[PDB]
Design an enzyme around this catalytic site. Structure first.
Site, mmCIF file in Angstrom:
data_model
loop_
_atom_site.group_PDB
_atom_site.id
_atom_site.type_symbol
_atom_site.label_atom_id
_atom_site.label_comp_id
_atom_site.label_asym_id
_atom_site.label_seq_id
_atom_site.Cartn_x
_atom_site.Cartn_y
_atom_site.Cartn_z
ATOM 1 N N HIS A 271 -7.781 -33.752 15.747
ATOM 2 C CA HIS A 271 -6.683 -34.609 16.227
ATOM 3 C C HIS A 271 -5.589 -33.769 16.873
ATOM 4 O O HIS A 271 -4.521 -34.349 17.190
ATOM 5 C CB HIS A 271 -6.189 -35.432 15.035
ATOM 6 C CG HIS A 271 -7.269 -36.284 14.459
ATOM 7 N ND1 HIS A 271 -7.596 -37.489 14.994
ATOM 8 C CD2 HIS A 271 -8.064 -36.118 13.389
ATOM 9 C CE1 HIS A 271 -8.578 -38.001 14.308
ATOM 10 N NE2 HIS A 271 -8.887 -37.186 13.321
ATOM 11 N N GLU B 247 -6.472 -7.340 14.012
ATOM 12 C CA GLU B 247 -5.915 -6.005 13.674
ATOM 13 C C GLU B 247 -7.051 -4.970 13.641
ATOM 14 O O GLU B 247 -6.781 -3.810 13.975
ATOM 15 C CB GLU B 247 -5.058 -6.030 12.426
ATOM 16 C CG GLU B 247 -4.100 -4.844 12.337
ATOM 17 C CD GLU B 247 -3.172 -4.919 11.143
ATOM 18 O OE1 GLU B 247 -3.685 -4.981 9.999
ATOM 19 O OE2 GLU B 247 -1.936 -4.990 11.374
ATOM 20 N N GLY C 34 -5.243 -2.552 4.351
ATOM 21 C CA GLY C 34 -4.470 -3.745 3.953
ATOM 22 C C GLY C 34 -5.284 -5.029 4.191
ATOM 23 O O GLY C 34 -5.374 -5.894 3.308
ATOM 24 N N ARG C 35 -5.953 -5.133 5.339
ATOM 25 C CA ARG C 35 -6.628 -6.397 5.721
ATOM 26 C C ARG C 35 -7.992 -6.499 5.018
ATOM 27 O O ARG C 35 -8.727 -7.494 5.268
ATOM 28 C CB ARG C 35 -6.712 -6.473 7.243
ATOM 29 C CG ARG C 35 -7.493 -5.367 7.931
ATOM 30 C CD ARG C 35 -7.187 -5.379 9.406
ATOM 31 N NE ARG C 35 -7.760 -4.188 10.013
ATOM 32 C CZ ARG C 35 -7.116 -3.046 10.268
ATOM 33 N NH1 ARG C 35 -5.819 -2.943 10.058
ATOM 34 N NH2 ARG C 35 -7.772 -2.041 10.846
ATOM 35 N N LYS D 178 0.881 -1.212 0.000
ATOM 36 C CA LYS D 178 0.000 0.000 0.000
ATOM 37 C C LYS D 178 0.903 1.243 0.000
ATOM 38 O O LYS D 178 0.801 2.030 -0.946
ATOM 39 C CB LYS D 178 -0.979 0.006 1.180
ATOM 40 C CG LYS D 178 -1.962 1.167 1.155
ATOM 41 C CD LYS D 178 -3.019 1.109 2.221
ATOM 42 C CE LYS D 178 -3.977 2.280 2.130
ATOM 43 N NZ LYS D 178 -4.858 2.328 3.323
ATOM 44 N N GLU E 228 10.197 -4.644 5.470
ATOM 45 C CA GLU E 228 10.367 -6.020 4.983
ATOM 46 C C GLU E 228 10.261 -6.023 3.455
ATOM 47 O O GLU E 228 11.134 -6.618 2.816
ATOM 48 C CB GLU E 228 9.397 -6.936 5.721
ATOM 49 C CG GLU E 228 9.788 -7.106 7.190
ATOM 50 C CD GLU E 228 9.042 -6.267 8.208
ATOM 51 O OE1 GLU E 228 9.366 -5.053 8.361
ATOM 52 O OE2 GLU E 228 8.156 -6.842 8.866
ATOM 53 N N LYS F 143 7.906 -0.877 15.099
ATOM 54 C CA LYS F 143 8.698 -0.485 13.904
ATOM 55 C C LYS F 143 9.806 0.537 14.263
ATOM 56 O O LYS F 143 10.959 0.399 13.802
ATOM 57 C CB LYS F 143 7.767 0.138 12.878
ATOM 58 C CG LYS F 143 6.766 -0.855 12.313
ATOM 59 C CD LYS F 143 5.802 -0.201 11.375
ATOM 60 C CE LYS F 143 4.987 -1.243 10.630
ATOM 61 N NZ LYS F 143 4.119 -0.584 9.619
HETATM 62 O O1 LIG Z 1 -1.389 -42.230 15.188
HETATM 63 P P1 LIG Z 1 -2.948 -42.695 15.243
HETATM 64 O O2 LIG Z 1 -3.177 -43.970 16.204
HETATM 65 O O3 LIG Z 1 -3.533 -42.778 13.851
HETATM 66 O O4 LIG Z 1 -3.703 -41.366 16.010
HETATM 67 C C1 LIG Z 1 -3.439 -40.092 15.438
HETATM 68 C C2 LIG Z 1 -4.091 -39.025 16.284
HETATM 69 O O5 LIG Z 1 -5.439 -39.370 16.542
HETATM 70 C C3 LIG Z 1 -6.252 -38.468 17.407
HETATM 71 O O6 LIG Z 1 -7.572 -38.946 17.737
HETATM 72 C C4 LIG Z 1 -5.583 -38.058 18.753
HETATM 73 O O7 LIG Z 1 -6.194 -36.727 18.952
HETATM 74 C C5 LIG Z 1 -4.002 -37.940 18.678
HETATM 75 O O8 LIG Z 1 -3.442 -38.173 20.029
HETATM 76 C C6 LIG Z 1 -3.325 -38.925 17.689
HETATM 77 O O9 LIG Z 1 -2.058 -38.462 17.501
HETATM 78 O O1 LIG Z 2 0.882 -3.100 2.273
HETATM 79 P P1 LIG Z 2 1.985 -2.297 3.161
HETATM 80 O O2 LIG Z 2 1.778 -0.698 3.103
HETATM 81 O O3 LIG Z 2 3.380 -2.813 2.881
HETATM 82 O O4 LIG Z 2 1.599 -2.780 4.756
HETATM 83 C C1 LIG Z 2 1.507 -4.182 4.970
HETATM 84 C C2 LIG Z 2 1.064 -4.438 6.390
HETATM 85 O O5 LIG Z 2 1.853 -3.679 7.287
HETATM 86 C C3 LIG Z 2 1.543 -3.749 8.743
HETATM 87 O O6 LIG Z 2 2.297 -2.852 9.584
HETATM 88 C C4 LIG Z 2 0.044 -3.545 9.114
HETATM 89 O O7 LIG Z 2 -0.035 -4.364 10.341
HETATM 90 C C5 LIG Z 2 -0.971 -4.082 8.019
HETATM 91 O O8 LIG Z 2 -2.239 -3.325 8.131
HETATM 92 C C6 LIG Z 2 -0.463 -3.974 6.556
HETATM 93 O O9 LIG Z 2 -1.279 -4.771 5.812
#
Ligand SMILES: O=P(O)(O)OC[C@H]1O[C@@H](O)[C@H](O)[C@@H](O)[C@@H]1O
Ligand SMILES: O=P(O)(O)OC[C@H]1O[C@@H](O)[C@H](O)[C@@H](O)[C@@H]1O
Ligand SMILES: [Cl-]
Ligand SMILES: [Cl-]
Ligand SMILES: [Cl-]
Ligand SMILES: [Cl-]
Ligand code: NA
Ligand code: NA
Lengths: 557, 557
Positions: B398, B367, B281-282, B220, B226, B520
């Protein structure tokens, strides 16, 4: 055999808890961090801790000094840990006692990373040789796949790995392969298929070749609804090309506790990588479930990952509570949750490779400590596990740090960064900028910006409130050298032992998950109704109304 | 010009708020959902709503009946909306009045998707022709790139798109291209580079060819720390291969408000896709910031995405509050946040393509509403925006549904599913199983499982508490036909107008973000200290201690 009665029933009955409530009422609730820093130049020395990683010969700095802590607060929290028998429960865990009291099971993820082969036993039988045998099998298999000695049914090198599994059979492998991407094989593509939603397997298979794809069927039970259906769909796609079922033995391996169900599926017994019932899913990446990690980054890097966890296990086991790093992290969580009313816990890694680290911690934390029943079978008189959430920074800063700085919630926050990047682009400029945000965000949350400072910068008088930062928003900062395999292993073990400490104080079972069963049973009933003309009316009016709308929109009788 | 004083100061001063507090004290706090469903067979008819999507000719069912609502509750919440002037603020937004009172700016994302060209104006000047001109430019450019008429500096078709941007310039493009993947060009690779962390740009460039890579510099302001650093690193990588700066005009385009900064960067004025200051932005994915979406899925699909938002804008604008879907969603959020003490809001799409939808909503919600200052410049006497979090189901089940079923927090939850899959694998079996979990999870959270039911199934008597489900855990279920471009547009607009409704009741500015500035400013100061031998001591002892450890570990004087 059976053991002793629990040391206590309700955390709220412990003398140290009542002293903490009095401490909160008279002092803790009036802590202003910027005032404590102004009055105490040794505050950072008092509340920081250094962990030596002997695997990569580095140090990880844990800075707790921007938390709502005084010397008196720390003394009372350590006292609560002693009254709650945190060290006793810890020592019982490491002895292989069945501390998982609702399933009568040991809790022995610590045995998986016992890289010094210290004696370890469950039910009077050593587990060390069996842990080592699976690891030696993982070593041999990963060497053969990576070298190209293991070949597909048409004699080609395997270039695609598809892990099929859900929850603890998915989140660890995803997070650790993403985190350790710099160590990953250049010619290997990984897919992690988990959702029952057919979009997940479809996108993975769309750009894979049966001739060069190896499948890891990752299931502790080998009876998970999602994983058996995904595995079945993978096997049909494979056989559509390979035609011959004998070919399955070069393209499918199993990571399971359940030999009988694996052999049922048509996986050769020699291609089964076992783990024990005393490995919880959310504590399983250290076991055979880590096979996708060892394929991607190699067995030696996998073993260094185990060894870093082992160094943090030793710290947890041997350090007096005053200096014990995961213990202090767990007590801070209790302090914020139960005395300040914080329902959440933010974890923001200043590291893009760690982008799946918060989602991993969300299962570890919330599935462990999202519990309401004590060892004595009573309903807790206090809140237990927080909602854990996060995204990598600096992305997180541009998404929801607005609410962290100016919103109406207390959000205990952990920021994590490595001092060195694997990708030091533009002579380190990207990394110095990332570091500047890691340092500045905790500074900013602590010091804020007074109405007087805002007016000094020339704000319209009637916009001063909008641009004021109250500050006094606590943080924990964790600074590592570099995200190596062993450093990542130690960071996960920190969160495992923090999670242990919370559950020990709350007097809950960190190691069961009874709370997933109702949804599974009700889903199976509804699936049969969807498959049955005229059925689906035996529910409440909302479930019935939604089921009917779904049958109308999906063209089901 | 200047306008009127706000209609109110503190939400807590409104008569309807005090009636809601009395309603909560005597009735709302004792709502047991399973009892209300047993006693009212028309409960689902009373509290469900149907939205017609006229773009794809489908309906989206919004079921609010598993919420803590009675007829009396709804009447009082709608009364609070009228006393807070939700409709007045809404109408001022659509007229282009400067309701963003801290920046003196219109809030006109609704103009971006004005697909019927209804008259729309800011500061007495129509904005319609300028919105349409950028869209016609986006149309022409996307046709040329997708057809291969637009060529690289060596005459090759563009196959890689790299979007460079952060927050609102990243999360929308990521989420919408992931969500609408079935509509995406088969030969196109997208990368979304956002983090300053050099790992992000490095991984994107590692597998890209300068000859076939087009960059979208999405900012914007075009002064984000960044994004300017990432863009600079991208331009150096490009020129390392292309040598000639004239070549930049075929490989770099800008999505910005700021022509002067874009031309400064070396982007040809003809390759600038503009948007106005009144696009937050959002709220920006609908603008030139959506260019990566229109490249991926084509301009016609992008326009259907705009049109679905437009249909939800019309619903929001024209529907009486009693039947108004985003309004009811926003009032429920106020009800849970300010009367039941809920600090969080779960959004779990039963859809793997929507895996980045919760992260997108986290910025939109947190935000916007992570604010503490009223229109009258007072500090709120009530909590504002929740922590919004989530992951796609069934993965989420899970990971952390254990805590949702058996933990100690109230977590208002939105479940979202399409009746039809784009990937109906194994004759629809994956999709019927996904649907069974969507239906069952809300059922299970509402009805729970009594100690009597647990004992009937043969549980050990002393494990009954561990396997009991208290139930009475509220949910909102949203059932669409199919996630098309227009259906996704309508779902985002729902959350935009829910977010508007919350901010209008709380009397905060949903549209500013003053809370990001302190971090910032402090990061820039610290970056200069990192670049300066002997500097970094002018901070609190923690920031100083961390900065010093970072300089030691990173080898900086
Ligand atoms: O590795 P499995 O026996 O397929 O289970 C996978 C996941 O199944 C889910 O029901 C549990 O929330 C987790 O503890 C588990 O990791
Ligand atoms: O699009 P720009 O001007 O680079 O800003 C990007 C983001 O910058 C952040 O500082 C704000 O939290 C957001 O509202 C914004 O979307
Ligand atoms: Cl002190
Ligand atoms: Cl992100
Ligand atoms: Cl009612
Ligand atoms: Cl997930
Ligand atoms: Na290492
Ligand atoms: Na459409």
């Amino acid at each position: 055999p059976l053991g002793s009665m629990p040391g206590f029933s309700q955390a709220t009955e412990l003398g140290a808890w009542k002293e903490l409530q009095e401490h909160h009422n008279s002092l803790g609730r009036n802590i202003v961090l910027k005032e404590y820093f102004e009055k105490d130049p040794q505050r950072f020395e008092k509340f920081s801790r250094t962990f030596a990683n002997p695997v990569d010969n580095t140090e990880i700095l844990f800075d707790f000094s921007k938390n709502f802590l005084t010397e008196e607060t720390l003394a009372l929290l350590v006292k609560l840990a002693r009254e709650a028998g945190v060290e006793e429960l810890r020592d019982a865990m490491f002895k292989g006692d069945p501390i998982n009291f609702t399933e009568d099971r040991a809790v022995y993820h610590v045995a998986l990373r016992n890289v010094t082969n210290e004696p370890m036993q469950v039910n009077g039988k050593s587990v060390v040789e069996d842990v080592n045998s699976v690891l030696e099998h993982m070593k041999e298999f990963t060497e053969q796949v990576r070298s190209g000695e293991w070949k597909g049914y048409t004699g080609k090198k395997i270039t695609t790995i598809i892990n099929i599994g859900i929850g603890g059979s998915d989140l660890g492998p995803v997070m650790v392969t993403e985190a350790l991407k710099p160590y990953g094989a250049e010619d290997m593509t990984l897919h992690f298929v988990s959702n029952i939603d057919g979009s997940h397997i479809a996108e993975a298979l769309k750009h894979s070749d049966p001739e060069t794809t190896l499948f890891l069927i990752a299931s502790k039970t080998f009876t998970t609804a999602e994983t058996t259906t995904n595995a079945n769909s993978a096997k049909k796609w494979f056989l559509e090309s390979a035609k011959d079922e004998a070919h399955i033995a070069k393209h499918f391996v199993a990571l399971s506790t359940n030999e009988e169900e694996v052999t049922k599926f048509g996986i050769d017994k020699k291609n089964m990588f076992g783990f024990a019932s005393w490995v919880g899913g959310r504590y399983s990446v250290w076991s055979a479930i880590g096979l996708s990690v060892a394929l991607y980054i190699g067995f030696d890097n996998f073993h260094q990952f185990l060894a870093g966890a082992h160094a943090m296990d030793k710290h947890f086991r041997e350090t007096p509570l005053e200096q014990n790093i995961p213990v202090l992290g767990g007590l801070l969580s209790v302090w914020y949750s139960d005395f300040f009313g914080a329902q959440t816990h933010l974890v923001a890694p200043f590291d893009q490779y760690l982008h799946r680290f918060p989602a991993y911690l969300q299962q570890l934390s919330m599935e462990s400590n999202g519990k309401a029943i004590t060892r004595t079978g009573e309903y807790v008189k206090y809140t237990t596990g927080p909602i854990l959430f996060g995204e990598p920074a600096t992305n997180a800063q541009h998404s929801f740090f607005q609410l962290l700085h100016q919103g109406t919630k207390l959000i205990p926050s952990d920021f994590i960064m490595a001092a060195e990047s694997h990708n030091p682009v533009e002579g380190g400029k990207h990394q110095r900028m990332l570091a500047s945000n890691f340092l500045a965000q905790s500074e900013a949350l602590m010091v804020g910006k007074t109405p007087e400072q805002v007016k000094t910068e020339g704000a319209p008088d009637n916009l001063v409130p909008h641009k004021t930062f109250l500050g006094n928003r606590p943080t924990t900062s964790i600074l590592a050298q570099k995200i190596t395999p062993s450093t990542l292993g130690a960071l996960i073990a920190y969160y495992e032992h923090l999670t242990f400490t919370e559950g020990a104080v709350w007097n809950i079972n960190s190691f069961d998950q009874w709370g997933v069963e109702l949804g599974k049973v009700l889903a199976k009933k509804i699936q049969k109704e969807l498959e049955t003309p005229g059925a689906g009316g035996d529910h409440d009016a909302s479930t019935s109304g939604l089921l009917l709308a779904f049958k109308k929109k999906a063209n089901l009788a």
